[PDB]
Amino acid sequence: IIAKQLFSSLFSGILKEMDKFKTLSEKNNITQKLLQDFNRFLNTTFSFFPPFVSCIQDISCQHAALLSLDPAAVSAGCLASLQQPVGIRLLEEALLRLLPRLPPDVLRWVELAKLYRSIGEYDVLRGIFTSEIGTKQITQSALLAEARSDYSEAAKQYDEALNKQDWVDGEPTEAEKDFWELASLDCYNHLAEWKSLEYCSTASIDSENPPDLNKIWSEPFYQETYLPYMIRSKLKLLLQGEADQSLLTFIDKAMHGELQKAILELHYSQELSLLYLLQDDVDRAKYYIQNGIQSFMQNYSSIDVLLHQSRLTKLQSVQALTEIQEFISFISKQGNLSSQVPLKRLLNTWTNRYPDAKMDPMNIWDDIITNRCFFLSKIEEKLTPISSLIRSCKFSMKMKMID
Amino acid sequence: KQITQSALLAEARSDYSEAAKQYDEALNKQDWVDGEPTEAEKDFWELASLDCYNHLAEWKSLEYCSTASIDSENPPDLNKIWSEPFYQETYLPYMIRSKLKLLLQGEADQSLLTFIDKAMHGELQKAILELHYSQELSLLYLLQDDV
Amino acid sequence: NIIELDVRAYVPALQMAFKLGLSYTPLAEVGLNALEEWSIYIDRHVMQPYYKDILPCLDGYLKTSALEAISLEEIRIRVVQMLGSLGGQINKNLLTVTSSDEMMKSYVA
Amino acid sequence: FIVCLNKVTKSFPPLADRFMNAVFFLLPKFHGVLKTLCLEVVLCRVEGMTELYFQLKSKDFVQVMRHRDDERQKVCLDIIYKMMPKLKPVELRELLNPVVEFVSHPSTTCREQMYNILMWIHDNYRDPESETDNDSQEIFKLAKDVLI
């Protein structure tokens, strides 16, 4: 940290006293070389060491004329290495200076929007496109409907915005097409019903009519936006009833790809663990859960201390991880397999344990409810070798759901 | 959008000089009115500019356009081609042809030489080069007497 | 039983315990045993107001991951398990000060 | 004394296995013609080995498969042929990979034995038994890769 701060201070001093050199053309000549090197750092690095990056932005806003840095590279480096707020400020300040698959420099806006998605300041996220970048009236009413949390109306309005072909008063741009797809993903995720969410996620990526999954990993856009919604929807479909094991055959090839193993161990421990719990690979699931604990600690340790929303969003998830651990602990013990006692205690603990229902949004309340429902439906099988009230507890627990 | 029609007219008369300026003003026009063209026509405009410049020699501007439409950096890059198939299957030939014709007249940066130095070590690139660019590599080597 | 007749009394003791626990682990282990031994036994309402001070000082354990009978990895995994299984409605209060504006100490020119 | 079993092979199989019981720790074979003789020695069908597949848990029975051309090496594949019924072929995955290349490797009788092996494989992992979870999905496509 002290080295970073010293480098920034000395560089600022050198650049400002270069104005004492004051010869006029070479400064514009050499700020170029500086900015290409600054670009290449983010363009080629693979460690993304945070304080180095924070330094790399620090020079940019101290002086001017260095703010023309490539938005996508610095933004993606920020999402990879965290340290988002300095990137937030850098793009924010770069948007001040007017200038004499997306041509316009407006892409600063969409990069900032993706980055705000990463930090989780969602209100400003609406404010970005409420700030009227990409105007055609129906979008405003769609933002209104989703702001009222009326995702049902927003779904139809977005769908009619996509299927509208008699466009008049001009045309929207494909950046708003991407925004519409992402907003549809979000509002469907707030509405469950993931069958349509699956259909949209699969269709927006690939053609084939029995839906494909394997040709994901074709471009980085696809993975870094559509992979999570896809996997979440398939898991939540599979855990309710039963359907095609395409996700299982999918992860069967996902592991053998070495680079894919890194992403999956980085972001989807819950997913793989619970999916394996379908096929009783409890040994693998236990490994995945201890690894998920590590992933959560590392992620939480990495995030900055001054951001309430990001910390809260990361924190809420541990409630499900602890339950997975508890369930896998309960599965493997013959003293509980053949007896009647522990299930009542477990039900007691679950019935005096629910997330806040005012603090915690639906997108995780539904998750905890669904995991409990699956847990009991699965445990029903092993008890057979009083049993009715287990079926009943789902009713009260979903009454708390509804309330 | 009307100006494209006159550009096609100018290039049909083989008057590539007027077509060049008309296409350039079509690209640099930012106060677009009566709606907007689509990016498919952007790709067509780039390709037509490549063709009409190829019929006009002066490949310095052809090089500048070919390099800029692909990559950012201000000392022009060549290495980050091979990033997508679109780039290779459309822009590679014009690029290599322009660089060769610049280098064979007078002398300039050997960036194409350092470029092909890495082009060979890529096995898949060797196939493309042996498939489509024998004249190019041969004459470029003739500069350095690798007879 | 001693912890249900009064709790404010022992809260500072627990606070110092898992505050100094970062330097000498067994105090952290003992305090993070007392936590569940309290939670599973004491009435929820009796302890619920107390959580506003019990958890916030525990965030220090969640600082560094860079990969004797008490180790950092065991206490870290166990404390994550504890702060999760204690309840969402409960661990909501983990922030440095829960739902307050007071904290820009050490963050001013 | 290998010949003193090799030429008396296919004689009284119920007691033709005491030799291997100690020879396996002692003369696992190389050296060409003698290698082929010991191959013909292993050709005797007997129950006397159950855990021996921990030997093939050592790798290099792959390039030795193609050491000398034509009929000499067929007992090597006949090994898997005669122990097919009880297996859980986690390792026949990789063991059949050079067999993918015995299409590339010259032989005709050995290729016929290849095709017989493949014909048994496809039928006998019970291809219509599409179990949702079993690992046989990989060997499905890699076996079809050569069967086609």
Best of A305, A307, A313, A328 to disrupt the C interface (most C CBs within 10 Å) is: A305
* HEC letters along D77-128: HHHHHHHHHHCCCCCHHHHHHHHHCCCCCCCCHHHHHHHHHHHHHHHHCCCC
Best of A38, A171, A177, A221 to disrupt the B interface (most B CBs within 10 Å) is: A171
Structure-determination technique? cryo-EM
Question: Closest by alpha carbon to A172, among A136, A131, A127?
Answer: A136
Beta-carbon contacts of residue D128 (< 8 Å; ≥ 6 apart): none
* Closest chain C residue to the Cα of A300, Cα to Cα: C62
DSSP string, C56-92: GGGGGGGS--------HHHHHHHHHHHHHHT-HHHHG
Which residues from D are below 8 Å from A248, CB to CB? 132-133
The neighbour count for residue A354, using CB atoms within 10 Å, is 19
CA angle, A28 then A31 then A32, to 5°: 90
Contact at 8 Å (CB) between B133 and B96? yes
Best of A214, A245, A280 to disrupt the D interface (most D CBs within 10 Å) is: A245
Contact D133 A279 (CB under 8 A): yes
Contact A315 C94 (CB under 8 A): yes
Single-letter code of the amino acid located at A182? L
Question: Closest by alpha carbon to A233, among A216, A247, A248?
Answer: A247
Q: How far, in Å, are A248, B4, C69, D72, D131 from residue D145 at the CA level?
A: 22, 52, 55, 26, 21
Handedness of CA A92, A93, A98, A103 (dihedral sign): negative
Q: In the structure encoding, which two tokens stand for residue A243, read together?
A: 């359907």
Q: In the structure encoding, which two tokens stand for residue A213, read together?
A: 């999954």
* Closest chain C residue to the Cα of A310, Cα to Cα: C95
Beta-carbon contacts of residue B104 (< 8 Å; ≥ 6 apart): B139, B143
Phi first, then psi: give them for residue B130, nearest 5 degrees. Answer: -70, -15
CA angle, A81 then A86 then A87, to 5°: 70
Subunits in contact with chain B (3 or more CB pairs closer than 8 Å): A
Chains D and C touch (3+ CB pairs under 8 A): no
The Cα of C85 is separated from the nearest Cα of chain A by a number of Å equal to 6
Q: What is the stated resolution of the deposited model, in angstroms?
A: 5.7
Decide if C89 touches A, using CB distance below 8 A: yes
Contact at 8 Å (CB) between B101 and B126? no
- Cα–Cα distance, A349 to B124 (Å, whole number): 61
Contact at 8 Å (CB) between A39 and B74? no
Contact B73 A101 (CB under 8 A): no
Tokens 């004459």 locate to B139
Contacts A–B by Cβ distance under 8 A: 15
DSSP string, A99-146: -----STTHHHHHHHHHHHHHT-HHHHHHHHHT-SS--THHHHHHHHH
Contact B73 A39 (CB under 8 A): yes
The Cα of A127 is separated from the nearest Cα of chain B by a number of Å equal to 26
Contact A315 C91 (CB under 8 A): yes
